[PDB]
Amino acid sequence: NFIVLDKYIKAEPTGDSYQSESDLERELIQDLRNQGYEFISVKSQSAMLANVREQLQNLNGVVFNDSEWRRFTEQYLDNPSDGILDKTRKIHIDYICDFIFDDERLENIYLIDKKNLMRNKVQIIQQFNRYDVTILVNGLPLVQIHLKKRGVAIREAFNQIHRYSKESFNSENSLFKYLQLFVISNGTDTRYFANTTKRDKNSFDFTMNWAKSDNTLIKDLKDFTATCFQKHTLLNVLVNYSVFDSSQTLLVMRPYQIAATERILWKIKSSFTAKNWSKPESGGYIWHTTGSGKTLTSFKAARLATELDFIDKVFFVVDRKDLDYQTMKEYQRFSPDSVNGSENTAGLKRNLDKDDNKIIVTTIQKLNNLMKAESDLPVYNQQVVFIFDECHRSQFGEAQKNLKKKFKRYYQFGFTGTPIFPENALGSETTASVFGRELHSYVITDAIRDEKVLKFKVDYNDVRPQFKSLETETDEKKLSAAENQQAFLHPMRIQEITQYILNNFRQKTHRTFPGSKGFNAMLAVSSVDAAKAYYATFKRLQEEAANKSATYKPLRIATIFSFAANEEQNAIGEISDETFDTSAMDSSAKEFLDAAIREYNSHFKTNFSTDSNGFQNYYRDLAQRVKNQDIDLLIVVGMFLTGFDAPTLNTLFVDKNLRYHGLMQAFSRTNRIYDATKTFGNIVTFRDLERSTIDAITLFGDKNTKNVVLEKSYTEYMEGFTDAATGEAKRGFMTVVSELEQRFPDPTSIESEKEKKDFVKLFGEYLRAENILQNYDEFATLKALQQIDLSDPVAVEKFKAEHYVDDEKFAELQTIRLPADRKIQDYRSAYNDIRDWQTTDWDDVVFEVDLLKSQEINLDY
Amino acid sequence: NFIVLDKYIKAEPTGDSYQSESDLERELIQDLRNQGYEFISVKSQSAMLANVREQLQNLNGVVFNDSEWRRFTEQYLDNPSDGILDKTRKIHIDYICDFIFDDERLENIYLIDKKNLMRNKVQIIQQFENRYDVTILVNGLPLVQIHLKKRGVAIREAFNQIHFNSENSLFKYLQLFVISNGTDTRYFANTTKRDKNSFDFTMNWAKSDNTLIKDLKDFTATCFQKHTLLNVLVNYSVFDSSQTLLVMRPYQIAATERILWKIKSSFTAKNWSKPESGGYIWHTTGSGKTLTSFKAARLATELDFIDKVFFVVDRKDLDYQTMKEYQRFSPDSVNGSENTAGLKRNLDKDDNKIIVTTIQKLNNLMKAESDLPVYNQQVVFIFDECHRSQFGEAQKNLKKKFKRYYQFGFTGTPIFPENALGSETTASVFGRELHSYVITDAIRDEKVLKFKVDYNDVRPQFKSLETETDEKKLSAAENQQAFLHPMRIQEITQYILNNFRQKTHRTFPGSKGFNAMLAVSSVDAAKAYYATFKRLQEEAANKSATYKPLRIATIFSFAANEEQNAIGEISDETFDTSAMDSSAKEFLDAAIREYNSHFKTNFSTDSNGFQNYYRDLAQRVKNQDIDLLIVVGMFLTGFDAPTLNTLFVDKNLRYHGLMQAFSRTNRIYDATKTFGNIVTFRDLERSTIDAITLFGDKNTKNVVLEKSYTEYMEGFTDAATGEAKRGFMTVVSELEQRFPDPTSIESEKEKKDFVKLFGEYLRAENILQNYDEFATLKALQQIDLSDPVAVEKFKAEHYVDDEKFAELQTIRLPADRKIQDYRSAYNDIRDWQRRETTDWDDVVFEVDLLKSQEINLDYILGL
Ligand SMILES: Nc1ncnc2c1ncn2[C@@H]1O[C@H](COP(=O)(O)OP(=O)(O)OP(=O)(O)O)[C@@H](O)[C@H]1O
Ligand SMILES: Nc1ncnc2c1ncn2[C@@H]1O[C@H](COP(=O)(O)OP(=O)(O)OP(=O)(O)O)[C@@H](O)[C@H]1O
Ligand SMILES: [Mg+2]
Ligand SMILES: [Mg+2]
């Protein structure tokens, strides 16, 4: 019974008023009642607890006495020391209470029946100005629906609730700590999101629309109720399509993630019933674009496949190059000490012999090595499921041959963001030929439309005339031959590239505002020699800057690299796999790496050795420190470029010849959504990759996909353009600056309620434009210009050579009239003065909360 | 192959200087080498770790690479964040490291082989970097450390010399300490628990007849035999739920191995289900029966041929610590209820042999069930003092239903023919006495304290009732006209309130002291007393804003009557509060609500509520949150509270019940707790002597009972040790004559002589604090230069006439300031002695008594 519908006929409105919260509330309660949700009147936690007692007793076939009920309540159901995370843990992991009754007998008390989902009781209650419907599961408040007036903007509604994170609890409301899901609606638009204490997942960007399997949205509250709020749909979303990970983050899956998972599950059942196993028609493949949640989804799909009573083993297979701190932490819980960068199979052989267990997490490298050496494994004759998460190739081809030869009853599935088509299978087997049919898809154009993945701002930094010919070279033989100190690794090119990165790092990563946290960056390079050259030049130029200024704030730079198997004899599209056996590297490489590791150790007070165990532990710690921004810039060759998840990484500096799938995978390191401060990922290249970018985008889309994936120009954001995909006109920053000065020249004078509303709407566009434009070198150069003031013999230029601007460009730039930095702060404080205060409609008005919050709070020193 | 020897031929000296630490060291290293201990030279932890690597590799048949060894070291062997407790936990519980090698293979790395003890490597080392110490290494781990002192040095002063430290972190693994001077050799556990760190907890090695092995050479030839030491470290050491390491005493080890041998014997000879299959242990009250029997039970589970081991306790003996311990082995099944659900469930648990239950629950189970698979299994029963009531019935069904069994009993007061009371004798039930450790032996060994027993004859109006011996009359006098008369209760309560602090050593400024219990005749008495305490304490708070009230609590339930007659056995109280009369239940709820308000607890009136109240109460009496606990028959037979020193008695205790109740005060603590005070308001002098004599002989009373006031004031000769003990007044006179004050103590010989004399002053005054006569004398040293209000207050409060008051004024005691002068001078000599002619060898300072009289900064800060 698919819960992400193939087809759905839109419901028709009742001729009754549908404008106020009460109107939305009445129809919500009515449709839910029509859909099997008993409406009950509760006006206290005492009445809520009495109802929980009835449901839990009913569900478990037990009757508590008052003493036993009070004891269950205080020790398991509503412990006063329990927070939201404890309740999430109780719903998703510890949902069974081993309860000892007064007669000393043991009873297993379930909060939810997860095997027979429809056995659970579902009820609805209403608020006891804050119009809310709550869905109760066995009396527990698991879903809360916020209803707002039709005119109110859903983003401001959501912002008003997250305004103050002072979510305090008491003995009269502590049952609400059990909430798993929130739904915010205004009638026309309806968005859902997880109840999580993790502020890094609490922005509007993580709110989701319900949808159909073709990924078309279900925005209308009435249609949302008729689909998402069906008992069978909601209970599956809460119990099976919600993840509570090792970091104690609750994640509710998006419709596309649910659509792919149930279609894989259905296909295993189908192929088993029809005895049609061990064929490409037994499994299938999923095309979910890079960064859309493939690693989240496939692992959950694997875990749900273990629940199929007829299945014996479920292999969840990842490429070791995609491993990072968070995924390694997660896999450690299921397959201890067996998912790492080594070639060892001992862990895999041990996990396979574990009884009362079906999940096997391993790498494609370890699975290949096992199938090579072993031929008498009992697993080969068992009913086995394979879930491959982006297992690229190199090792996958060999792995497929032994798999088809040794495994007798299997269903294999693959998840990929960049499939192998014939047009890029000139030295590989296609996704379709390996796996069979495309079970579900969620393409980059769908992800961008949904704001579930960010766009790319891609630019070649053409500011080195001496080296342009090398940097614009298209011949493969010439590019590989130019990997030396006379060509690409020339001290002056490396000094020029590094000096640009040091001067523009803070601009690119939004660290320019004083109290602003900002983002961090990565630098992907051509070779181990390039990695060496850059790390050295960064250290040199940074040591030089610390001498010339005691006010200098250095950046924490790190590097990691190993030996690439096919660096000489390969292609150009696939990023070369690096071994975890450091003893394969040349003496100077190993020497340089140890020197960098010792500097890392001294700074972070760590003791990572040079050996295999040492490097593996260094890889893990490095991944975590780049993700939490302990490291400002990570220098890499081919590592942390295909699976590394870092939502606060926004800039990728590139001095490498990236092509097709490798280009998409690498650029996508910056594509994670965060909040309004992260508008897109910056791609700054020192080799011309404009053609390679368009070729890569077009391969996993069409001729138009580049207009959606790539960000617009500086002139366009300064003067205005019309988005082709949305059909709407976006006002240019200069148009907004002009209107701000004409309509509101105010020294503090402001005006009426109509002017205040008009200003908030205007300055909101300003903040959104200024923040988007921070990512533009042209805008940075323009903003830097507003600083000088001199007369007769004194200090001049410097700006020209640092911004690579001639005397002609510098002449016209002075004519550009921008508002004074104090007037912007006057507008920023005038805007903040209208923060809340408590005619003219303030309904459709949205404040830039995330963009504002980049203020000057407790940075003091 | 017993490690507590039935016979041992004393070794002869080598005839070589045996006087200095070096002499003792050479012979120790030599005898240990002769006994299979390889002597190795180690001068650093690096050399110590290299040796650990060799031993652990050898033992486990594995070879670490340097990366794997550094990883094992940092993550399991020598974690920098690990303390002594972590290492104790690793030796006794987590001794197997599930190690993942660089090739991803799993290996179970053992620190010790516990199944094949003799496979372990034993080595000896001596102090690296003047200190004299021999360390015994087990698989390279320093588990035993021997402190060697020269022959003249007093072992108590040598113990007072050494025991947080810091590094050479491998030494955090030490389990046992041995302190010797050649002549005397004592061992003790390495524990971070200061309440178990006094000299009182150091032990001598011994033979199964409990005769001591004091000589270091004989100690080495017995305790330090590889097979003996390794068993002591691995099998005869307890690391409990409170993370306290306890090394068993020889008698506890002797009883346990004799029970274990007997199970093997009877099994091999197919001679099960007979009294000749098991046996019984006579270990006096408070000697460690609950520690020993439970360990004996757990070691019996290691017998591959045994299927189930029942460790059976009386619910009456349960307290916070034992309940906490049993919860780990038999969750939610060892409590005061009648329920068998927990027991049935623990019995059905696979990969488990230990069953902890109560005699009440086991009886109820055997009554209702007859088709249990356990009845046909090879089963061991260890009964820890199951106060024979439900036991008789339990024995009937046991012999009937269990087909292959070995039953053992542990008791401090056995059932002899002279005290059968309807119940069959210990010998007829269990068979032969496998081991014994009598009160005489415990007192001699200072493993149990003596009793100071006295009838407070200060109520002439009520004496005839209080001295009545007729059973019918005593039971009839349980009313408001006789025993529960408001005046008698006011008089008894007023005495307790006025003398509580004196009895419990809370008088000196800054002293923690002890707490007390009041055992009463009936629920009506409990009510009367709790009410009078509240009344008299509310009256005192009004009459003074300087009044410091006492935390008083009470607990009681319903018993029965003359069920199986007796006044000797303490009547069992049910945990079913619904059986109580309305007024009792009413009063108890009122007291529980007052308790709840004070301690911020929420114990309800129901069964679950009362059970939780019992548990919390036990912990608060043990940690002294409660100053006085008022009881009828609860916490009188098994409650362990080493800081409880006084038992006020307004109850007719006889024989086993008298011994069991008085023993609540018998736990050893330190030098400040010389004996347990028994203050009775009913004459129990004959009952006391009758009870002592029943579990000893006609002379046992001279050992168990403390001497009189006059004797401690003027001197007496200890019959048991043949030694003359100087009286407090003789010492006071010698102090004034031989040391007028801070001049004379100028020479090295005068200092030594003053330390020996003042030591005795501190010891005698602390013994004498427990005497009403001495308290009255000390109280007189303020009173007046005319104030008839105070003179009359003194006389009435100390129940002193005009004649006694006349002579008491002639007693010339030293000035309070002069005592303080002697006390600071004494500390200055101790301070100067640690900083280092006359010989200071045999000199012992009163460290524990000095520390209680220090008046530290964590007290003077009072505003
Ligand atoms: N359902 C969801 N709810 C909330 N956050 C989500 C959801 N799906 C994905 N995310 C978050 O989005 C980020 C990207 O997800 P993930 O790493 O699984 O992507 P991916 O498609 O496998 O990426 P790549 O192609 O780089 O390997 C993660 O931080 C993840 O936790
Ligand atoms: N080997 C030992 N080392 C240290 N302390 C010990 C040892 N044996 C007993 N003790 C301590 O002595 C005290 C009395 O022990 P325990 O309660 O087991 O005595 P018992 O014989 O069962 O007494 P009772 O007759 O009152 O039931 C406890 O605090 C216990 O921890
Ligand atoms: Mg991924
Ligand atoms: Mg006991």
Short mmCIF file of C-alpha atoms in Angstrom, two decimals, chain A residues 339-461:
data_model
loop_
_atom_site.label_atom_id
_atom_site.label_comp_id
_atom_site.label_asym_id
_atom_site.label_seq_id
_atom_site.Cartn_x
_atom_site.Cartn_y
_atom_site.Cartn_z
CA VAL A 339 33.53 -0.05 7.90
CA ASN A 340 36.77 1.85 7.25
CA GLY A 341 39.31 2.49 4.44
CA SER A 342 41.23 -0.83 4.79
CA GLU A 343 41.17 -4.02 2.62
CA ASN A 344 40.49 -6.34 5.61
CA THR A 345 37.60 -8.85 5.52
CA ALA A 346 37.92 -10.23 9.13
CA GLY A 347 35.22 -7.85 10.40
CA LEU A 348 32.92 -8.75 7.48
CA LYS A 349 33.50 -12.55 8.05
CA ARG A 350 32.64 -12.02 11.80
CA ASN A 351 29.49 -9.90 11.21
CA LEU A 352 28.27 -12.57 8.73
CA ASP A 353 28.55 -15.25 11.50
CA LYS A 354 26.52 -13.15 14.03
CA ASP A 355 23.18 -14.79 14.92
CA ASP A 356 19.98 -12.71 15.58
CA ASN A 357 21.25 -10.21 12.92
CA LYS A 358 20.51 -9.51 9.21
CA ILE A 359 22.20 -6.09 8.57
CA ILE A 360 25.75 -6.17 7.13
CA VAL A 361 27.41 -2.74 6.55
CA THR A 362 30.60 -3.05 4.48
CA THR A 363 32.62 -1.33 1.73
CA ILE A 364 32.65 -2.37 -2.01
CA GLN A 365 36.47 -2.89 -1.51
CA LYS A 366 36.00 -5.35 1.43
CA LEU A 367 33.03 -7.12 -0.30
CA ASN A 368 35.15 -7.54 -3.50
CA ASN A 369 38.14 -8.90 -1.48
CA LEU A 370 35.82 -11.36 0.40
CA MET A 371 34.16 -12.69 -2.83
CA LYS A 372 37.65 -13.08 -4.43
CA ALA A 373 39.10 -15.20 -1.52
CA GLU A 374 35.94 -17.05 -0.34
CA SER A 375 33.72 -19.54 -2.28
CA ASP A 376 32.15 -21.77 0.47
CA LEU A 377 30.22 -19.06 2.47
CA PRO A 378 26.75 -20.12 3.77
CA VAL A 379 25.53 -16.57 2.82
CA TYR A 380 25.87 -17.42 -0.93
CA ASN A 381 22.81 -19.77 -0.75
CA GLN A 382 20.71 -17.48 1.53
CA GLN A 383 17.90 -15.03 0.53
CA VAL A 384 20.09 -11.87 0.31
CA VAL A 385 19.38 -8.12 -0.38
CA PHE A 386 22.10 -5.71 -1.68
CA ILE A 387 21.80 -1.93 -1.37
CA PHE A 388 24.64 -0.10 -3.11
CA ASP A 389 25.03 3.53 -2.12
CA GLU A 390 26.92 5.34 -4.98
CA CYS A 391 29.47 2.53 -5.38
CA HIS A 392 31.02 4.44 -8.40
CA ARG A 393 33.17 1.71 -10.20
CA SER A 394 36.95 0.67 -10.40
CA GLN A 395 36.15 -2.02 -7.71
CA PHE A 396 32.39 -2.34 -8.56
CA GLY A 397 32.91 -4.07 -11.95
CA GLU A 398 34.98 -6.92 -10.44
CA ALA A 399 32.55 -7.07 -7.47
CA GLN A 400 29.54 -7.54 -9.82
CA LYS A 401 31.21 -10.50 -11.67
CA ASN A 402 31.86 -12.51 -8.44
CA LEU A 403 28.44 -11.49 -6.97
CA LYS A 404 26.46 -12.93 -9.97
CA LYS A 405 28.74 -16.04 -9.88
CA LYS A 406 28.67 -16.76 -6.06
CA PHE A 407 25.26 -15.43 -4.75
CA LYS A 408 22.36 -17.79 -5.67
CA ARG A 409 19.20 -15.96 -4.33
CA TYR A 410 19.61 -12.16 -4.49
CA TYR A 411 17.89 -8.78 -5.08
CA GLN A 412 20.33 -5.95 -5.75
CA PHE A 413 19.57 -2.22 -5.72
CA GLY A 414 21.70 0.80 -6.46
CA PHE A 415 21.40 4.48 -5.48
CA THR A 416 23.18 7.09 -7.67
CA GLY A 417 23.12 10.86 -8.35
CA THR A 418 25.15 10.51 -11.59
CA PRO A 419 24.16 7.25 -13.47
CA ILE A 420 26.40 5.47 -16.03
CA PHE A 421 24.69 6.11 -19.41
CA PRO A 422 26.11 4.74 -22.78
CA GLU A 423 27.51 8.29 -23.48
CA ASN A 424 29.76 7.82 -20.35
CA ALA A 425 30.00 3.94 -20.39
CA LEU A 426 32.80 3.94 -23.04
CA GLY A 427 34.86 2.10 -20.34
CA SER A 428 32.13 0.80 -17.90
CA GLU A 429 28.79 -1.14 -17.65
CA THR A 430 25.60 1.06 -17.59
CA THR A 431 23.40 1.54 -14.44
CA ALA A 432 20.40 0.04 -16.31
CA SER A 433 22.34 -3.06 -17.55
CA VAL A 434 23.74 -3.72 -14.01
CA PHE A 435 20.59 -3.06 -11.93
CA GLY A 436 17.52 -3.22 -14.23
CA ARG A 437 14.71 -0.62 -14.21
CA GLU A 438 14.66 2.92 -12.63
CA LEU A 439 12.32 2.35 -9.63
CA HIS A 440 12.15 6.11 -8.70
CA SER A 441 13.80 9.43 -9.66
CA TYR A 442 14.39 12.86 -8.13
CA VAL A 443 16.49 14.84 -10.57
CA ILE A 444 18.65 17.97 -9.88
CA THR A 445 15.90 20.26 -11.49
CA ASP A 446 13.31 18.78 -8.97
CA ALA A 447 15.82 19.22 -6.03
CA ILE A 448 16.61 22.85 -7.00
CA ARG A 449 12.85 23.64 -7.50
CA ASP A 450 12.18 22.18 -3.98
CA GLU A 451 15.20 24.05 -2.43
CA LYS A 452 16.49 20.67 -1.11
CA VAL A 453 19.91 21.18 -2.81
CA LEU A 454 21.68 24.52 -3.51
CA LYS A 455 22.63 25.99 -6.96
CA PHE A 456 26.30 26.55 -7.98
CA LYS A 457 28.07 29.86 -8.57
CA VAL A 458 30.88 28.57 -10.97
CA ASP A 459 33.67 30.95 -12.13
CA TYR A 460 37.16 30.72 -13.61
CA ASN A 461 39.41 33.31 -11.81
#
